[PDB]
Design a protein around this ligand. Structure first.
Ligand SMILES: Nc1nc2c(ncn2[C@@H]2O[C@H](COP(=O)(O)OP(=O)(O)OP(=O)(O)O)[C@@H](O)[C@H]2O)c(=O)[nH]1
Ligand SMILES: Nc1nc2c(ncn2[C@@H]2O[C@H](COP(=O)(O)OP(=O)(O)O)[C@@H](O)[C@H]2O)c(=O)[nH]1
Ligand SMILES: [Mg+2]
Lengths: 434, 77, 249, 369, 430, 49
């Protein structure tokens, strides 16, 4: 009865959609052809829809302008799973240009995208909200994501939207003009995304290096871990638990002010197959490891700031009194400090289903897990660094012609700069104690 | 550069030991014509690139689905 | 089943008897596993049209892989005259059961014990060509014949004449003793110069043959042996002049 | 000196996934070295474990340091070539004129040095018997042989070993038994042959015919139902250490000599769940269910059905004490005294309750089929 | 899909393109008769990018062959892989340019270019979606440097949005081959700057140094140099033809590498290059590849990179590797050599990944760089030009065919201007 | 409408244990008989020692 809609745009969006969908298919035991051997509760309704006889079709849509990834998916190992004409592919790359995908080429695909969204939402009956995946530091991703958010925020309105975006690392970065796109996309998403989640790359690189002891990781490990996080987040809607929390119990329990909805995640335990069975895997130790700054999902030091709200979701056979005692110790230790106007800051969710493991993966089969989502004032530094880079490379009108020649006016940079400065001022102001 | 010079046309053997004799030797061994075929033609591919290990891998964007655990098939109880 | 599903994909649905007739028309070997490569080749040739001036190229049958077996033969040449016999002996040894075909891993083993570290991609081409319908077994006789190449009719007839001449002195009866007692070890210089001594030449010859001197020999096995010897030599003239010295004929 | 290396895989249970090691074997001094393919650390270094040379072969299972390993294949050309010789398969047959001599026949076959890979006994019905020996048809031997064939229960076995296809035949002796006595008295046909059509045993002659009989008799698609009864009978099990130490021939004839009638024996490979499950009556009693169950699954084992007027307690009388150390002192002529070593591996195991023999024999001969 | 057409003019262009098409056909597994005999299916997914299918199933290149004399085309047609090119794609003159830019750019170049314009028009309009044009030519010759650049201007006139790449065999004084180099060089680089979207400069002297040092071949041949240029130029466009983890098109490269509209002259390099006797004695790893590619002596240009600061750079890795080591090597090379990179633009390195290495190879690296060190070529060319022009030597063969010295003065002024504001950023600080 | 399947599944689930207990007691009685049998056998063995 309850469903969500998955939006996947950009190469990052598609390469994370592949991982999240293989994980979801494996968790419900759906074969790649879509059939259910089974051998029956309706726990697949959240992500899949029955075709009337046999197979199940995911409730997701894929957008991108360069056909390469889409064709590779259509010829991959899940060729007969997805709906063939909901994998919308464009003609020409936006090629790392914000204006291209938002003013010139992106306007001829939004009509098809909205038509497909309408067709799928009409099939849906108890829609909970939207989960969007996009890469900010790229032309087509940023532009099409901004345009889609603009269109949905007017067409559908109050239905919640959560965006799992991938900002640049402080130094581990690929593109050179990418800060421009990042600033403009943040400007676009600030007043349109209900929740935003940080998914930078080098932090997860450090995570996999330190825990799995994998010296040769690629994008696949990153995407698998991110998919694990998403599944742990969305388990409660489809699995039985002691304290179920739905998607509407995120912004009502985690967003102090409408402007402040940027958040950063963490997941535990992260361990290999050899080091796990010689370890204790206690609830207290995993919840202590969840708060380690080096275990955090994004390159920020939360010790440089305060905490506003945290939502933690356990899966496995955890016990509520154990959770309460662990949280008491968390509040007891002084290294982490909360804000005065938040006496109670913890949301607790519990799910009975233990985490599922993928064959050929890196993580071991574990019987307890915790996924934590935190809103904190320590998000200021990443935006400060992005602004610093933007100012340094904008002092002399670098690469401005590439943007102005596509139709976008010059003055848009100033507006984004001033709005980001206002956001930084707001995060500063909320940090003063009464 | 006073190459060629005191090393004229010769096939097989260890040569004369002046100039780049070592480097021409392995070229002459792997392929006929150690140096500059007379205008038996010379293919630039072997001269430039090197030893050819013919292999074409997979994209590994298509390795997402396929992963096998032989253990699961045990009868258990 | 997959074939009729593919027909449904294009939208041409027909009853089972017509489907069976269409399937059998192209499944000539009656094995039951059609090759859509040949299927689409036939359709492409049909759709290209008829033009006397220009041929439609394309393919109606799987081609010989070419350079993988070419390099195989070239690098097999270097080990020596009896490298070819080595592959035959290894095939018989690996086929401990005497069926005439080998499993896939067994073919891999025989290749690596010959000593060629073929990569997966290079191996796959020859593998897929030599196993037409993915039955699971490969016929080693055809493989070795193609690797060796083509034998001349006059050469084979001369080999038969040598076998008959050898059998004549023994009264039609065969033994490896006869070939060991009568031959020319020094004739090997003309197929290729070698510095090894004549006293040892007998030792290598008996070693590459069997230890027992009373083993039964068939005419086909004998001519097969000298065909393996010939395949190392690139000149029919040199080979037959070597055979003439070897049997004093 | 020279090294034999393999590839082996071990199924962990705390970890679901299975691992893989190499198990190099220094033969000059009989020691074992363990090294794993993935993550590149040495697993077990330079410790002798006293493993006999004969048991190393494809598909073998060997325990070491409380973990059981199963060899899958070799790891290099040098190891592969040496053991590639010993793989020939032959199909031997025991016709019912020597049903009383099964133990001696098996003893001689084992002493020959070959390995009894698989074994079964059945009733060769008329139609499939006519199908078998198809090539003969025209000759007068045909009808007489067919009428002889379906007479009684038959024992079919497979022999794997070096030079086996003719080694088995030369051990067997001449085709006719009348000649066999004057030419080769010390032969199977010489000792247990009566006349031309009543020859003791049968062997293969060509590899193709041997394979034909093999997939006729042992393949998964066979028309030979396991002819066996399920009333007034007792079940017994030859433990794997007995067949490893090669006394199965002696054991079988001993129980045949006691007037008991053997009804069916078959070779079985079973895993640890099956082992604990068949021993479901000894979980909470002192015979140390865990150790005996884990040992029972460490190799092939024969399951015999024995028939007699009062099967259970009478067979128990010959079986004697469950502990051979008990048995040696007091019951010196009982089979467990003669063959058992200690508590865990006390040779034969038979039922020890009056009314549960039928269910146990049904478990082996109906459920595990 | 997003296909590109090929145009080559002059002797240098013809030979370079012949080698390039042999390389591409070898990579895609196409026989000299034009029949596919490849192994894997990946070779056919994007085969339409560089080839067109004809009746019967044979593939033909979409290349245009252009020159004022028939000898070089008659040679290339007779040479290997000469049968692939469609005979109608040849356009040739009967007179020749005589290494005179005016001859190749005003009189017979103009009366001849109508046919080649028609052919390129029909070829471009035939395909579904053009992505751009690539030109290979020499600025030191007559017919190439004149007619090719006039064709560049013409095609840019009707295709203002599509990208244009040039591969220019610029002259170097060490290996001097013609006395009238300064004139046609300056004029070609004049009408090149306002039209060519990207330029890639190549030096024969640099190629000779590379061949003698890295490959260490006793007596090389233009086949070797053409093959190296073909390898780099083919490696440029791998993301368009093969799947990968980070696809990057020519527009992506232009956006990431062009800070200002007039700074589009680029210098390139290829890795790895090893001697035949030392092929088995070195490992293959990302640190080794980056160490080899960043080497200044490895570059395909006579300019010394360490005499100026890199503005932007891009690398197109091929084969199997991991993104963390890729980006970590970029970060390390950016940190340990901060002096050679301009500071007011942070993270001036692009990395892109393709899953398909060149045939017979495990990993390959193509590097393209925009750096201030290229000003030296224009400086020396302008020095020669002014020194030889103050005496008006060889000038009358130009001036007697509709040429005026005022546009020579314009060319000198424009090149000095480009040098001025192109070295200004070397000293420019934030 | 969906409640019927829940009702059925609960009924089968509880009946399963309802019969499992009988199976367990059937297995358990043989435990005691066999234990007594070997108990008497062992003491007879000891006394004859
Ligand atoms: N972690 C992770 N990041 C990815 C992956 N694929 C792409 N990205 C991110 O995407 C960013 C660049 O955007 P692109 O992936 O090239 O695509 P885009 O954002 O839609 O814009 P275009 O490049 O024009 O297509 C890089 O900085 C990467 O961080 C991936 O598989 N894993
Ligand atoms: N690298 C390289 N340079 C070449 C080749 N052919 C000619 N050149 C150079 O081109 C210059 C002469 O150009 P030219 O053919 O007269 O130009 P065109 O008259 O316009 O065709 C000489 O300086 C040569 O060094 C070649 O195959 N490779
Ligand atoms: Mg893209």
């Amino acid at each position: 009865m309850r469903e969500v809609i998955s939006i996947h745009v950009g190469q990052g969006g598609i390469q994370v959609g592949n991982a999240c969908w293989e994980l979801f298919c494996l968790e419900h035991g759906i074969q790649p052809d879509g059939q259910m051997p089974s051998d029956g509760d309706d726990a697949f309704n959240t992500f899949f829809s029955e075709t009337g006889a046999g197979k199940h079709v995911p409730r997701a849509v894929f957008l991108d302008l360069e056909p390469t990834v889409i064709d590779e998916v259509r010829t991959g190992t899940y060729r007969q799973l997805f709906h063939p004409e909901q994998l919308i592919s464009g003609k020409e790359d936006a090629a790392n240009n914000f204006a291209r995908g938002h003013y010139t080429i992106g306007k001829e695909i939004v009509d098809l995208c909205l038509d497909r969204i309408r067709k799928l939402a009409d099939n849906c009956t108890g829609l909970q909200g939207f989960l969007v995946f996009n890469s900010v530091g790229g032309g087509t991703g940023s532009g099409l994501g901004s345009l889609l958010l603009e269109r949905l925020s007017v067409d559908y309105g109050k239905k919640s939207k959560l965006g799992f975006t991938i900002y640049p690392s402080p130094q581990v970065s690929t593109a050179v003009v990418e800060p421009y796109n990042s600033i403009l996309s943040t400007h676009s998403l600030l007043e349109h995304t209900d929740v935003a989640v940080m998914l930078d790359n080098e932090a997860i690189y450090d995570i996999c290096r330190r825990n799995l002891d994998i010296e040769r990781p690629t994008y696949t490990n990153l995407n698998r871990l991110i998919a694990q996080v998403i599944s742990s987040l969305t388990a409660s809607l489809r699995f039985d638990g002691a304290l179920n929390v739905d998607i509407t119990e995120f912004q009502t329990n985690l967003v102090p002010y409408p402007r402040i909805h940027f958040m950063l995640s963490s997941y535990a335990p992260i361990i290999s197959a050899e080091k796990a069975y010689h370890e204790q895997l206690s609830v207290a130790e995993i919840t202590n490891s969840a708060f380690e700054p080096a275990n955090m999902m994004a390159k920020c030091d939360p010790r440089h700031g305060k905490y506003m709200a945290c939502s933690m979701m356990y899966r496995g056979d955890v016990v509520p009194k154990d959770v309460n005692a662990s949280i008491a110790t968390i509040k007891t230790k002084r290294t982490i400090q909360f804000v005065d106007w938040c006496p109670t800051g913890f949301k607790v969710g519990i799910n009975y289903q233990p985490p599922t493991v993928v064959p050929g993966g890196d993580l071991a089969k574990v019987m307890r897990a915790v996924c934590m989502i935190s809103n904190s004032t320590a998000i200021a530094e990443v935006f400060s660094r992005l602004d610093h880079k933007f100012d340094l490379m904008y002092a002399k009108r670098a690469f401005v012609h590439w943007y102005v020649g596509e139709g976008m006016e010059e003055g848009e940079f100033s507006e984004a700069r001033e709005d980001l400065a206002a956001l930084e001022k707001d995060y500063e102001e909320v940090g003063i104690e009464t | 550069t006073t190459l060629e010079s005191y090393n004229k046309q010769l096939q097989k053997g260890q040569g004369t030991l002046i100039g780049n004799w070592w480097e021409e030797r392995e070229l002459r061994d792997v392929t006929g014509i150690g140096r500059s075929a007379h205008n038996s033609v010379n293919d630039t591919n072997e001269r430039t690139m090197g030893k050819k290990f013919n292999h074409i891998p997979n994209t590994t964007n298509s390795e997402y689905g396929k992963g096998f655990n032989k253990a699961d098939q045990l009868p258990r109880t | 089943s997959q074939f009729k599903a593919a027909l449904e994909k294009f939208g041409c649905v027909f009853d089972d008897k017509e489907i069976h007739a269409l399937f059998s028309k192209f499944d000539v070997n009656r094995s039951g596993k059609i090759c859509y490569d040949e299927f689409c080749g036939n359709f492409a040739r049909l759709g290209s049209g008829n033009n006397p001036n220009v041929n439609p190229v394309f393919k109606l049958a799987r081609e010989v892989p070419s350079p993988i077996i070419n390099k195989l033969n070239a690098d097999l040449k270097k080990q020596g005259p009896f490298a070819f016999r080595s592959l035959s002996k290894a095939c018989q040894k690996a086929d401990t059961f005497l069926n005439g075909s080998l499993s896939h891993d067994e073919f891999k083993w025989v290749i690596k014990e010959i000593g060629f570290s073929l990569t997966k991609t290079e191996f796959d081409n020859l593998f897929k060509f030599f196993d037409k319908n993915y039955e699971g077994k490969v016929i080693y006789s055809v493989f070795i014949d193609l690797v060796r190449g083509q034998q001349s009719e006059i050469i084979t007839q001369s080999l038969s004449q040598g076998y008959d001449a050898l059998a004549s002195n023994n009264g039609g009866k065969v033994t490896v003793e006869s070939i060991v007692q009568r031959y020319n070890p020094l004739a090997i210089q003309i197929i290729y110069p070698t510095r090894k001594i004549a006293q040892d030449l007998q030792r290598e010859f008996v070693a590459e043959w069997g230890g027992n001197l009373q083993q039964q020999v068939n005419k086909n096995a004998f001519v097969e042996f000298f065909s393996d010897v010939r395949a190392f030599c690139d000149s029919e003239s040199k080979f037959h002049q070597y055979f003439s010295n070897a049997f004093g004929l | 000196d020279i090294r034999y290396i393999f590839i082996v895989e071990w199924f962990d249970t705390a970890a679901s996934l299975i691992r893989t090691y190499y198990l190099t074997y220094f033969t000059q001094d009989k020691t074992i070295e363990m090294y794993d393919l993935k993550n590149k650390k040495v697993f077990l270094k330079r410790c002798e474990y006293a493993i006999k040379d004969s048991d190393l072969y494809i598909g073998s299972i060997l325990n070491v340091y409380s973990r059981q390993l199963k060899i899958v294949d070799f790891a290099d050309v040098f190891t592969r070539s040496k053991f590639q010789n010993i793989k020939e398969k032959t199909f031997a047959m025991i016709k019912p004129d020597a049903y009383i001599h099964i133990g001696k026949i098996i003893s001689i076959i084992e002493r020959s040095g070959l390995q009894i890979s698989n074994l079964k006994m059945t009733k060769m019905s008329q139609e499939d018997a006519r199908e078998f020996y198809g090539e003969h048809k025209g000759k007068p031997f045909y009808d007489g042989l067919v009428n002889f064939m379906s007479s009684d229960l038959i024992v079919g076995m497979e022999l794997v070993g070096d030079n086996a296809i003719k080694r088995w035949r030369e051990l067997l002796g001449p085709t006719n038994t009348l000649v066999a006595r004057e030419q080769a008295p010390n032969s199977i046909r010489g000792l247990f042959g009566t006349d031309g059509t009543r020859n003791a045993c049968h062997g293969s002659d060509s590899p193709g015919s041997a394979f034909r009989e093999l997939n006729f008799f042992f393949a998964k698609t066979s028309k030979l139902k396991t002819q066996a009864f399920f009333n007034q009978c007792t079940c017994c099990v030859i433990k794997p250490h007995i067949v490893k130490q090669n006394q199965v021939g002696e054991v079988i004839d001993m129980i045949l000599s006691e007037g008991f009638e053997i009804s069916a024996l078959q070779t079985f490979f079973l895993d640890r769940p099956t082992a604990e499950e068949f021993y479901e009556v000894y979980k909470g009693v002192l015979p140390e269910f865990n150790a005996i169950a884990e040992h029972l699954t460490s190799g092939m084992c024969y399951a015999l059905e024995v028939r007699q007027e009062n099967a259970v307690k009478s067979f128990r009388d010959i079986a004697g004490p469950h502990d051979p150390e008990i048995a040696k002192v007091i019951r010196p002529n009982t089979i467990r005294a003669r063959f058992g070593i200690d508590r865990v591996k006390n040779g034969i195991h038979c039922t020890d309750l009056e009314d549960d023999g039928v269910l146990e024999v049904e478990y082996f001969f109906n459920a595990l089929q | 899909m997003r296909e590109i057409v090929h145009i080559q003019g002059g002797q240098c262009g013809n030979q370079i393109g012949a080698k390039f098409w042999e390389v591409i056909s070898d990579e895609h597994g196409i026989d000299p008769t034009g029949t596919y005999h490849g192994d894997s299916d990946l070779q056919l997914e994007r085969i339409n990018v560089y080839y067109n299918e004809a009746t019967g199933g044979r593939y033909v290149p979409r290349a245009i062959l252009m020159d004022l004399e028939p000898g070089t085309m008659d040679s290339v047609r007779a040479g290997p892989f000469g049968q692939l090119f469609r005979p109608d794609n040849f356009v040739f003159g009967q007179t020749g340019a005589g290494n005179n830019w005016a001859k190749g750019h005003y009189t017979e170049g103009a009366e001849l270019i109508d046919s080649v314009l028609d052919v390129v028009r029909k070829e471009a309009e035939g395909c579904d979606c053009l992505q751009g044009f690539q030109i290979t030519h020499s600025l030191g010759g007559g017919t190439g440097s004149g007619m090719g650049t006039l064709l560049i201007s013409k095609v840019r006139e009707e295709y203002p949005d599509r990208i244009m790449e040039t591969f220019s065999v610029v002259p170097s004084p060490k290996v001097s081959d013609t006395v009238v180099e300064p004139y046609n060089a300056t004029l070609s680089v004049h009408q090149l700057v306002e039209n060519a979207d990207e330029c890639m400069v190549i030096d024969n002297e640099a190629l000779y140094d590379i061949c003698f040092r890295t490959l260490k071949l006793t007596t090389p041949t233009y086949g070797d140099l053409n093959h190296l240029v073909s390898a780099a130029m083919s490696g440029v466009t791998c993301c368009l033809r093969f799947p990968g983890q980070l696809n990057s098109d020519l527009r992506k490269l232009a956006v990431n590498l062009i800070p200002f509209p007039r700074l589009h002259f680029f210098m390139i390099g290829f890795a790895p290059l090893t001697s035949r006797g030392s092929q088995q004695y070195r490992a293959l790893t990302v640190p080794e590849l980056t160490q080899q590619m960043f080497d200044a002596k490895n570059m395909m240009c006579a300019a010394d990179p360490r005499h100026g600061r890199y503005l932007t750079a891009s690398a197109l890795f091929r084969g199997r590797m991991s993104t963390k080591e890729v980006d970590e090597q970029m970060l390390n090379v950016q940190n340990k050599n901060s002096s050679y990179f301009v500071e007011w633009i942070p993270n001036n390195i692009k990395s892109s990944i393709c899953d398909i290495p060149p045939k017979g190879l495990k990993m390959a690296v193509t590097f393209v760089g925009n750096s201030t060190a290229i000003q030296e070529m224009f400086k020396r060319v302008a020095e020669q030009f002014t020194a030889m022009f103050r005496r008006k030597a060889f000038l009358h063969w130009y001036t007697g065919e509709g040429m005026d010295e005022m546009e020579f003065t314009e060319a000198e002024s424009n090149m000095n201007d480009l040098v001025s504001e192109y070295q200004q950023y070397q000293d420019a600080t934030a | 409408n969906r409640g019927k399947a829940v009702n059925e599944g609960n009924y089968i689930k509880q009946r399963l244990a309802e019969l499992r207990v009988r199976s367990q007691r059937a297995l358990n009685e043989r435990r005691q008989k066999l234990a007594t049998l070997l108990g008497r056998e062992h003491e007879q063995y000891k006394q004859e020692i």
